[PDB]
Amino acid sequence: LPVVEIELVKPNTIQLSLIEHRTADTNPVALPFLYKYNPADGFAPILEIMEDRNERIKEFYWKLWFGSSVPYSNDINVEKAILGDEITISSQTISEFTHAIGNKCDAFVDRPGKATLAPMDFAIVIGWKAIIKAIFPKSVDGDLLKLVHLSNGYKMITGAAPLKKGDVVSTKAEIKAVLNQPSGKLVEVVGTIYREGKPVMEVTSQFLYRGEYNDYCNTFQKVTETPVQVAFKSAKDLAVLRSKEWFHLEKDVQFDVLTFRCESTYKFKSANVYSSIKTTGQVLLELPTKEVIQVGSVDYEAGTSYGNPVTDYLSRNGKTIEESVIFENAIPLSSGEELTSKAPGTNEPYAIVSGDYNPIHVSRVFAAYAKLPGTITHGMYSSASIRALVEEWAANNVAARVRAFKCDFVGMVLPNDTLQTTMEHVGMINGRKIIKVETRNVETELPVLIGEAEIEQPTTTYVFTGQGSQEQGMGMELYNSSEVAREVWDKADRHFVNNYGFSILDIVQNNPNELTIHFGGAKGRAIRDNYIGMMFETIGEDGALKSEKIFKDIDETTTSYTFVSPTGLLSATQFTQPALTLMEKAAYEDIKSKGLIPSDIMFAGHSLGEYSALSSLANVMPIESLVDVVFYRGMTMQVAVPRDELGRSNYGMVAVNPSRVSATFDDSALRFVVDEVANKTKWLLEIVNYNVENQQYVAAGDLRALDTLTNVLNVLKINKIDIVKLQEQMSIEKVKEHLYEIVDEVAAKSLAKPQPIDLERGFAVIPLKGISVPFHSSYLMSGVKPFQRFLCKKIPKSSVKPQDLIGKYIPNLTAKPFELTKEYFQSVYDLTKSEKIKSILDNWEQYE
Amino acid sequence: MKPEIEQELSHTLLTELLAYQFASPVRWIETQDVFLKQHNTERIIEIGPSPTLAGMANRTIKAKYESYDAALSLQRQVLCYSKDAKEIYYKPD
Numbered sequence: 001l002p003v004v005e006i007e008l009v010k011p012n013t014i015q016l017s018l019i020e021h022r023t024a025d026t027n028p029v030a031l032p033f034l035y036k037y038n039p040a041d042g043f044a045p046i047l048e049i050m051e052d053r054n055e056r057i058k059e060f061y062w063k064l065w066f067g068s069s070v071p072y073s074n075d076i077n078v079e080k081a082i083l084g085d086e087i088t089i090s091s092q093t094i095s096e097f098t099h100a101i102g103n104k105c106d107a108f109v110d111r112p113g114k115a116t117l118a119p120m121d122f123a124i125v126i127g128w129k130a131i132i133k134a135i136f137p138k139s140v141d142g143d144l145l146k147l148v149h150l151s152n153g154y155k156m157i158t159g160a161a162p163l164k165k166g167d168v169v170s171t172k173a174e175i176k177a178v179l180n181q182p183s184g185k186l187v188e189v190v191g192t193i194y195r196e197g198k199p200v201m202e203v204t205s206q207f208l209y210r211g212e213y214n215d216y217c218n219t220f221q222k223v224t225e226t227p228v229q230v231a232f233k234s235a236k237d238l239a240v241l242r243s244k245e246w247f248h249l250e251k252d253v254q255f256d257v258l259t260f261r262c263e264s265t266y267k268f269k270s271a272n273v274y275s276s277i278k279t280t281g282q283v284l285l286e287l288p289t290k291e292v293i294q295v296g297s298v299d300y301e302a303g304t305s306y307g308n309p310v311t312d313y314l315s316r317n318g319k320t321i322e323e324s325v326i327f328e329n330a331i332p333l334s335s336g337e338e339l340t341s342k343a344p345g346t347n348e349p350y351a352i353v354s355g356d357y358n359p360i361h362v363s364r365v366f367a368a369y370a371k372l373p374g375t376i377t378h379g380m381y382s383s384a385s386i387r388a389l390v391e392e393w394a395a396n397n398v399a400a401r402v403r404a405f406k407c408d409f410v411g412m413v414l415p416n417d418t419l420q421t422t423m424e425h426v427g428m429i430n431g432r433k434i435i436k437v438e439t440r441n442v443e444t445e446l447p448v449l450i451g452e453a454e455i456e457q458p459t460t461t462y463v464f465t466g467q468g469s470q471e472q473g474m475g476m477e478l479y480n481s482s483e484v485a486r487e488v489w490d491k492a493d494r495h496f497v498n499n500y501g502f503s504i505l506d507i508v509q510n511n512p513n514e515l516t517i518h519f520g521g522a523k524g525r526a527i528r529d530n531y532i533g534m535m536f537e538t539i540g541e542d543g544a545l546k547s548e549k550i551f552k553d554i555d556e557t558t559t560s561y562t563f564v565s566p567t568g569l570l571s572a573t574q575f576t577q578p579a580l581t582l583m584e585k586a587a588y589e590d591i592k593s594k595g596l597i598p599s600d601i602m603f604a605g606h607s608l609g610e611y612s613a614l615s616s617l618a619n620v621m622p623i624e625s626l627v628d629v630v631f632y633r634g635m636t637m638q639v640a641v642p643r644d645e646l647g648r649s650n651y652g653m654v655a656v657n658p659s660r661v662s663a664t665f666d667d668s669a670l671r672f673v674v675d676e677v678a679n680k681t682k683w684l685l686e687i688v689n690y691n692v693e694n695q696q697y698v699a700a701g702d703l704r705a706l707d708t709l710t711n712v713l714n715v716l717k718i719n720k721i722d723i724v725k726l727q728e729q730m731s732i733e734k735v736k737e738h739l740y741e742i743v744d745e746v747a748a749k750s751l752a753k754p755q756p757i758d759l760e761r762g763f764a765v766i767p768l769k770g771i772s773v774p775f776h777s778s779y780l781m782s783g784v785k786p787f788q789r790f791l792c793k794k795i796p797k798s799s800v801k802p803q804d805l806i807g808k809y810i811p812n813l814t815a816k817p818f819e820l821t822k823e824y825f826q827s828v829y830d831l832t833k834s835e836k837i838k839s840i841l842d843n844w845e846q847y848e
Numbered sequence: 849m850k851p852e853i854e855q856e857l858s859h860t861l862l863t864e865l866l867a868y869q870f871a872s873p874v875r876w877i878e879t880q881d882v883f884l885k886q887h888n889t890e891r892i893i894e895i896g897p898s899p900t901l902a903g904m905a906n907r908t909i910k911a912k913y914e915s916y917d918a919a920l921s922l923q924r925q926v927l928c929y930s931k932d933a934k935e936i937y938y939k940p941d
Contacts, residue, residue, distance in 0.1 A: 331938055396923070425938055458890050461883045465896020465929075474897060587895050596938075598891065606901055607874045610866055620862065691876030692908070774871075781871030791863045800862055802854045813869045815878035816886065820861045821854055828861075828868035840860050847853045 003365050005030070012037050014046070018366060020060075020359045022348060024067040031060040031366075057144045058136055064357050065132055076137035078178075082191065084130035084171020091165035093125075094118045097353050100344055102381075103388035106397050117399045118163035120201070121384040123154065123193055125354050127203045130173030131191045132356075135207050139218040140178050142185045142209030145360075145370045149379045149409060150186070154387075155202030156404030156432075156454075160195055169195040176204075177221035180268065185209040188221070206408075216268050216275075225262035225281065230317030232257055246310055250283055250296020259284040259321060262298070264308055277302035279310045291798035323430035325593040330426040333435050333453075334394035340442065341385060343377050343417040350381045372412065379409040382419075382449055386437050389421060390453040394435075400599055401456040403432050411441070411448030418442045423453060431597030432456065459600035461810065462587060462617070466580050466608035468768065470570055472511040475583030479505075485586045492582050492627045500631070501527040502563075504582065507575045514564040519554075528554060531561070536636040536786040545785070550639060571770055574634035577611070578627045584612030585621065592616070602810040602817070607691075607776070609812065618805055625794045636786055640773050648756055651779065653688070653771045654706040659695040660764035661717040666694050669724045673709045674699070676739045681705055681747050686831070688776035691812075698768070700777035703757050707750040708743055713764045715742070781832050788836065884913050884924075891925050893936060899928035 005017040014035030021028040034049035034056075055074065062072045076082070094116065098104060107117035124131065134140070135147065160167075173191030180186075190204040232240075238255045241247055262281030269275035279300035287293060300310050314320075344350070347361040356378060359366035367375040383405065391401045413419060420442045427434030432454030439449035478485040489505060496504045501517035501524065519528035531554045540546040554561050565572040570579060591597060603613035611630075615621035641649040656673065658665040667690070674687045683705040689698035699709055716723070726735055750757070759767045773780050781787060802820060811818040814827055825841050828834060849857075883889040894901055905926055909917070917924060927935050934940065 327938075329939070331940060396921075459887050460889045460891050460893060463892060463894035463896075463901055465894065465898060465900045469898070469900060471897060477897075584895065600887075604879070606876070607869065610869050620866075687873055689874055691874040692880075692904070693877055776874070777871055779871070781868045788863070788867050791867065792859075795863075797859050798855070800855065800859045802851075802858045805858065805862060810879055810882060811865075812874045812876065812879065813865065813872045814875055816882045818865070820865075821849070821857050824861055825864075828864040828872060832868045832872040834864060834868065837860055837864055840857065847856070848850075 001028070003363065012039075013049075018359070018363075018369065020064065020357075020363055020366070022351070022362060023064050023357050024355070025069070027068060029060060029063045029068070032056055054141055054143055061144045061358075062136065064359075065355070066129070074136065074138050076133065078134075078137055078139055078175055082130045082133045082173035082175070084127070084173060084191075086168075086170040087126060089126075089163065089165075089167040089169060091115075093353075094122075094163055094165055097122060099349055101350050101353065102385045103392065105392060105399070107399050115165045118165075119384065119388050119402055120154070120162065121387045121402075121405070122163075122354075123201045124152070124203060124205075124380060126169055126171050126193060127173070127191055127201075128355050130171045131189045131203065131205055134173055134175040134189045134191070135187045137175075140175075140185060140187055140209075141215070141218075142187075142213065143211060144209075145366075146184070146210040148208050148210055150206040150208045151204075151406075151408035152206070152379065152383050153202075153204045153406040154404050155204070157199055157202065159198045160200040162399070162402070167195065169193060169200060177223065177266075178219055179221055180213050180216055180219050180271070182212065183208055184211040185213050216270060219268040220266060221268070222265040223263070225260070225264065225311055225314070226320040227259050227261045227284065228311070228314040228320040230258040230260075230314055232317065244309075244313070246279065246300035247283075247298055248296075251285065253285060253287065255285065257285060258314065258317075260298075260314055262310060262314065264300075264311060266308070269304070272306065274305050274308075275303065277305055277308050279308065281310065289798045290796050323593055324427065324434065324595065325590065326427045326434070327425070327594060330424045333423045333425045333455075335422060335424065337420075339389070339393045339423060340418060340420050341389070343413050343415050343419060344381070345416040347375065347377055347381070347415060350378055350384075354378070354380060356380060374414050376412045377415050377417075382409065382413060382439060383407040386421060386439060386449055386451070390423075390435070390437065390455045394423060394453075394455055398458055400458070401454075403454040403456070405451060405454065407437075407449055407451040409448065410450055411439075411446050413439075413441065413448050419448065421449070427452060428591070428594035428596060429454075430593075430595050433595045433597075457598035460598045461602050461604050462613070464584055464587070464605035464609055464613050466584060466605065466612050467576065468608075470576055470580060472508070472568075472570065474508050474570070474579055476509055478583075478586060482586065482589065484589050488585045489582060491624060492578070495624050495627060496578075496631075498523070499527060499530055499628070504575070504578055504627070507569050508579050508583070511568045511570045513566070513568065514562055515569060516560055516562045519559045519561075524559075528558070532556075534632055534635070536639060538636075538640055538785050539783065567770070572634075573638040574631055577634040578630045580608070581611055581615075581621060581626055581630050585615055585626075587613070588616035600808075602808050604810050604812070607812045609809075614805075614809070617808065620796070620800060620805075622794070622796050622799075629790055629795070632790070633787065636789070637773055637775070637780055640780065640784060640787075643772075644756060646756075649772045650703045650755065651701065651772060651774045652703055652706065652759075653698065653700050653768050653774070653776075654710055654759045655689075655696070655698040655766040655768065656710050656713045657695070657764045657766055658693070658697050658713070661713050662720065663694075664722060664724065665713075669722070669727065670697075670713070672723065672727070672739075673697075673712050677705050677708050677712075677743060677747075680740065680743070681708065684774070684779050684782075685709060686778035698776075700771075700774035701779060702774070703759070704750050704755075707753075707757055707759060708746045710759060710765050711746040711749070712743060714762060715746070717764050778832065791836070880908055880912075884909065885916060888922070890922055891927065893927050895929040898930055902926045902928045 001021050002019045005019060007015045009015045014037060016033040016035060018031040019028055023029055036047040038045040038047055059072050103119050172194050173189060176190045177188030178185060187207040190202060192199050193201040193203060241255050260281055265278035267275040281298045283296050283298060351357055351362060360370055361375055361378050364375055387405045391399060395401055419439050421437060421439045424436050426436055435453035437451045437453045438447050440447045479489050493503050493505045496502055502515055519525055531551050535549040535551050537547055569575050603609055603617035605613055641651050643649055658670060678685050683702050685701035685705040687699045689696055726738055761767055806820040807817050809818040825837055829837060883892060909924055
């Protein structure tokens with residue numbers, strides 16, 4: 001087919017016409033090039049018609065990118081956004097995008113079943129039509145042949161979902177900047193994408209009219225700022241903010257810090273100096289009890305300025321809300337030859353699927369005319385291939401790692417050329433692990449693509465370690481190696497020293513046998529009345545609710561008090577629990593501003609992910625009233641039952657392990673000890689553990705019933721009379737009296753042995769000791785009155801959000817992703833009972 | 849559900865857990881079925897002075913999820929803060 005046509009149209013003028021057949025409507029289009037022949041001067045006999053040349057080029061490119069059907073309108077109003085065209089993402093387009101184009105894996109190949117996976121990089125296919133319409137307007141006048149696509153970027157406002165063959169989405173383009181740099185006009189198009197109203201993707205692209213342009217009246221840059229946080233700590237901050245004439249008072253709360261989400265508008269009169277500045281922005285600062293509501297804005301104008309006061313001020317005080325702190329040293333991610341990619345032999349497939357029919361990519365004559373070396377491949381193709389690459393080689397077949405992707409086309413790639421994309425584990429932002437992506441040609445070594453990868457992992461569960469085995473030096477390595485851990489430990493230590501007369505670091509670092517609080521001057525007496533005032537109000541089991549306060553020893557007369565514990569003070573509840581909450585008060589910590597965060601994290605542990613997992617990932621444990629609450633709870637819980645003369649109660653823990661008796665014992669085989677000891681003996685008992693059931697059963701209660709429950713598995717371990725026969729062979733309802741021999745002997749032998757019992761640690765019985773009050777069962781959350789004294793107050797009632805806590809916690813008191821909404825109400829209400837949520841379950845009132 | 853209703857629901861039920869989980873039977877069975885089978889966590893991370901759960905997690909993976917991992921080609925990497933500190937922060941030797 002014709003690709004070049006030189007022809008004499010009218011006397012003495014040439015009409016070199018570059019022909020392009022593969023177009024939007026498969027209709028050949030000519031690109032004229034007027035040329036005055038000069039017989040008079042044979043030294044240079046060909047002058048070129050430079051006037052209207054750019055107009056002709058834009059005419060050609062308009063027919064190419066939009067079709068002959070739509071008329072060419074050079075006049076495009078810059079200020080108004082460029083409307084695209086509402087399309088419907090069909091299954092067909094996703095099925096046939098990939099023939100030689102890129103992403104192929106287990107979910108991107110011809111297989112039966114259901115919806116085939118796809119990448120989001122084909123959002124510019126939706127976008128392209130409107131994005132490129134902002135490089136045409138008369139105000140932005142440039143040579144389209146010399147235009148090079150410089151960069152392209154995608155943002156991650158994830159109101160949407162990945163491609164599922166049937167989405168329905170529209171386009172919305174809007175020009176942001178038209179700069180005049182020494183490289184030429186830098187057109188900035190950040191045309192966003194709407195799926196019925198709600199924005200889905202931002203999609204920023206840069207074009208560069210290579211050359212040199214001096215038109216500065218038609219030059220501007222309306223940049224929108226980020227939520228920039230300033231840094232201050234003083235009362236001079238108010239004075240500084242008042243001194244700023246641009247700022248206007250639109251709030252009534254004290255100032256110490258900003259996090260403005262602003263936006264400005266530049267107008268260049270020369271290379272660097274701005275003809276005018278326009279800034280309107282928004283104002284931000286913290287609100288009451290973590291309960292934030294609406295805010296106000298700002299205003300600013302200028303003229304003939306070398307900078308923007310507002311943005312420079314916000315930056316100068318400090319960096320923005322930066323969820324990206326770069327990791328210390330680099331290691332490889334998928335480096336090697338198993339990350340190399342050969343450029344496609346040709347460019348027509350990606351051109352037809354995407355709609356970019358720029359002949360520079362396909363037509364040899366066009367590429368030669370633009371003086372660039374050969375038909376270079378699409379920058380869009382390279383970006384798409386790399387975005388598919390962040391999911392493909394660094395991952396073991398999971399397609400949930402395709403996200404926001406920033407890219408720039410520093411180099412050029414010829415077709416059928418091999419490229420070594422390097423991907424090194426360097427930076428880190430808020431989950432989407434920043435990895436470099438640099439696509440360098442293998443033989444020239446020059447880079448072509450630069451960006452930062454955002455590859456995820458599958459879901460995970462940050463487990464923890466803690467109560468029940470806690471040792472000396474607990475979490476002191478992080479205390480000595482971390483600034484934030486030092487901060488939290490120091491704050492808690494200062495509060496304990498200033499309010500309770502003991503350092504918690506001293507308890508944790510060098511575990512003492514006993515410690516002495518002293519009640520000295522004003523500080524000491526302000527410490528003493530803390531202990532005087534706080535203590536439980538528990539019903540005495542001899543009548544009604546006995547309103548009482550037992551610290552006993554401490555009163556007005558006493559000037560000291562000694563906390564004593566033989567094995568260790570870190571074993572004592574009042575010091576083991578605050579230490580626990582503090583030592584895991586920092587896990588997310590630096591990964592918080594780093595980005596190692598995998599796909600879906602739940603803060604958990606081994607039933608100690610409710611006291612040490614939910615501040616780094618859930619921020620529930622407030623700041624410093626945490627230690628007060630936990631220490632008060634420790635004391636209240638510790639003196640919740642009558643001690644004897646030697647200081648030990650008739651209550652506690654014991655294990656009744658099923659693994660040792662036989663492999664036969666299962667939930668359908670021995671789930672009877674709990675409801676066959678409480679009913680007759682008229683005691684208190686409930687099983688604490690079947691977490692790893694068929695291998696681990698533990699229980700808590702009054703010590704006699706614990707002995708009775710153990711001497712069921714114990715007596716049926718050396719004799720081995722199966723309970724499967726008792727339960728499923730004959731019947732279930734009828735057999736409610738077979739126990740009244742086999743637990744009767746024990747409910748007698750246990751009384752025969754001395755009342756303070758030290759339960760033996762046998763084969764199928766492995767008690768955990770050092771616990772006096774029965775928790776994890778039914779007497780340390782039952783009628784136990786003053787345990788939830790502080791449960792609708794100081795704790796940040798307004799901070800707790802369903803958004804994170806729902807789904808980002810997994811229930812140890814159930815199973816899968818803890819729903820922290822109505823669905824879970826009767827789970828802490830059946831096996832433990834409650835009265836607090838009876839109201840929310842029944843009395844809903846006026847919640848609407 | 850409106851955000852303000854569900855935040856009252858939020859704090860109420862979260863207070864209910866923080867009270868009652870410390871006196872209610874722990875059910876780590878289906879939690880294991882979540883981070884091993886149902887939710888498909890291949891990388892599990894533990895932060896603590898000692899690996900108190902890495903060993904027993906390996907025990908359950910071997911005793912219940914060996915053929916399951918072989919069938920679906922899942923390679924589980926268990927990590928702890930005391931020993932596998934280099935793998936958590938991604939610093940190989």
